[PDB]
């Protein structure tokens, strides 16, 4: 038959909800079944532009999102979208001193 060497597009590993304290560098990944394709990144409904803190990378299947020196302003939700297929994770900056248990 026709062996799909071009792996049919799918969201195998969805975006993962990463939580880290400010100052840390983050790199959230999403495994898109299609090798070496690009996707629009979104942060809280906005097109995520790789400026300053933000860096966007793409591997074979997985798409990576880097935030160096993360801020609570860069938190909430990230969404990786490729035309139809989309994915999302809650990025939380780890943070509150009064966490009800020092």
From Swiss-Prot:
What post-translational changes are documented for it? Autophosphorylated.
**Which species does this protein come from?**
Mus musculus
Q: List the disulfide bonds.
A: 30-80
What's the stated role of this polypeptide? Answer: Key component in the assembly and functioning of vertebrate striated muscles. By providing connections at the level of individual microfilaments, it contributes to the fine balance of forces between the two halves of the sarcomere. The size and extensibility of the cross-links are the main determinants of sarcomere extensibility properties of muscle. In non-muscle cells, seems to play a role in chromosome condensation and chromosome segregation during mitosis. Might link the lamina network to chromatin or nuclear actin, or both during interphase.
Q: What is the name of this protein?
A: Titin
Q: Where are the TPR repeats?
A: 38-71
Q: Note what the entry says on domains.
A: ZIS1 and ZIS5 regions contain multiple SPXR consensus sites for ERK- and CDK-like protein kinases as well as multiple SP motifs. ZIS1 could adopt a closed conformation which would block the TCAP-binding site. The PEVK region may serve as an entropic spring of a chain of structural folds and may also be an interaction site to other myofilament proteins to form interfilament connectivity in the sarcomere.
What family does the entry list?
A: Belongs to the protein kinase superfamily. CAMK Ser/Thr protein kinase family.
Q: Where in the cell is it found?
A: Cytoplasm; Nucleus
Limits of the Ig-like domain: 7-92
On assembly, the entry states: Interacts with MYOM1, MYOM2, tropomyosin and myosin. Interacts with actin, primarily via the PEVK domains and with MYPN. Interacts with FHL2, NEB, CRYAB, LMNA/lamin-A and LMNB/lamin-B. Interacts with TCAP/telethonin and/or ANK1 isoform Mu17/ank1.5, via the first two N-terminal immunoglobulin domains. Interacts with TRIM63, TRIM55, ANKRD1, ANKRD2, ANKRD23, and CAPN3 through several Ig domains. Interacts with NBR1 through the protein kinase domain. Interacts with CMYA5.
């Amino acid at each position: 038959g026709i062996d799909p060497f071009t792996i049919e597009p799918a969201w195998e590993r969805h975006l993962q909800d990463v939580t880290l304290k400010e100052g840390q560098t983050c790199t959230m990944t999403c495994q898109f079944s299609v090798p070496n394709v690009k996707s629009e990144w979104f942060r809280n409904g906005r097109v995520l532009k790789p400026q300053g803190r933000v860096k966007t990378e793409v591997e074979h299947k997985v798409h990576k999102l880097t935030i160096a020196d993360v801020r609570a302003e860069d938190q909430g939700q990230y969404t990786c979208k490729h035309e139809d297929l989309e994915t999302s994770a809650e990025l939380r900056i780890e943070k509150g001193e009064l966490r009800s248990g020092c």
